[PDB]
């Protein structure tokens, strides 16, 4: 049960960005699209200002065929992890999607971190986080 969204969107192209990934463009958006390897990760910098729970979407495509496990670390500007959570990106056709979670955690305004990351992210692509 978060608090209103703000209308804000942080491209994932311009997010941080670790592993093996490429970006393509797709369906006229332009998205990271993750391969194969352990050492794969997406991490957003994000900015909030007045105090409340988050809710963060995330359009994404899962090609895989399968729900494709994700641990998600929100973590403040001092590397304190506020929240771990599993993140499961159902399966997606050859289209961009959305997938909801929240913060967990009532947060005061600053500078925080949404952080993606699994041992397989091979066929998943992020175009932004919205917030
Ligand atoms: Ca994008
Ligand atoms: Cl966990
Ligand atoms: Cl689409």
Not at 21 to 37: A, C, L, M, P, S
Not at 40 to 59: H, P
Not at 62 to 81: A, R, W
Not at 100 to 126: P, Q, R
């Amino acid at each position: 049960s978060s608090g209103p969204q703000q209308g804000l969107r942080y491209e994932a192209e311009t997010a941080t960005l670790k592993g093996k990934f490429r970006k393509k463009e797709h369906r006229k958006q332009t998205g990271v699209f993750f391969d194969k390897g352990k050492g794969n990760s997406i991490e957003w910098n994000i900015s909030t200002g007045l105090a409340q729970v988050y809710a963060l979407r995330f359009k994404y495509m899962n090609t895989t065929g399968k729900p494709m496990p994700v641990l998600m670390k929100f973590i403040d500007s001092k590397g304190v992890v506020l929240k771990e959570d599993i993140l499961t990106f159902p399966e997606t056709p050859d289209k961009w999607k959305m997938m909801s979670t929240t913060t967990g955690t009532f947060i005061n305004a600053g500078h925080y971190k949404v952080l993606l990351s699994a041992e397989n992210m091979d066929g998943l692509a992020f175009d932004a986080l919205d917030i």
